[PDB]
């Protein structure tokens, strides 16, 4: 889609995790990094790197 509410939701979550960045487990870090992979793939480039 690149343009839907679902996209907006996913990017809002990625923004959320970027702010705190104090993860507490494998799933949280895997989530964030999988969000970044998704963002870079969908919108080509974005401002944040994988941790």
């Amino acid at each position: 889609a690149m343009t839907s509410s679902a996209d907006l939701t996913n990017l809002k979550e990625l923004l959320s995790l970027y702010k705190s960045l104090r993860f507490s487990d494998s799933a949280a870090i895997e989530k964030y990094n999988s969000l970044v992979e998704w963002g870079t793939s969908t919108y080509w480039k974005i401002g944040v790197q994988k941790v």
Binding site: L8, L15, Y43, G47
Partner: protein
Amino acid sequence: QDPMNSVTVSHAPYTITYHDDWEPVMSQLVEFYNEVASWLLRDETSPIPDKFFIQLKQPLRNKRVCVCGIDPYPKDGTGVPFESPNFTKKSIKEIASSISRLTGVIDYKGYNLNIIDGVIPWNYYLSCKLGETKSHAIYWDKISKLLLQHITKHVSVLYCLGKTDFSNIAAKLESPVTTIVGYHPAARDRQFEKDRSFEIINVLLELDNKVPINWAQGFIY
């Protein structure tokens, strides 16, 4: 006067005025325009020749977002992308609805992207034959590619309206930029009504530590 410059070409409009920020592409532009313009000036165009390049007067250094259409309005192009100074065109009216709902501004007389802080509205191709869309693709081609590369060294985000029109846009650019391709505001099934490209842009900026865009500044009351 101070940030502005001029260069002379062999064909209408004969003089091209630009902001200093465009300087690194003007040499090539002159060259390419001189080779095509004769062929291109045969048709009545939208907008008129004298308005083709007015968007080169915009600075680029303060620009976070480029909002991009494929070519000008087939009739009544002012030289400024998206602008309907009497607020007539569907595209700008529909964009205004989006922005209405997103900011809850109920009452307004019109809307202009070219007054909005940090946005540069753009047209990939600079003219079309009166009443015909994409009629001048073949002539603009290498210029459009040249000008759009320049814009994407300065913007964080490129927002293109037209899935079909901008499918293979990344191929037109050398170096990456945050790129989003949404629906053209006149599209089947109201798909643009449900498009959230404006919220999405703002999140993407925030992810680049850039200040989001105040979409509401574009209203005219």
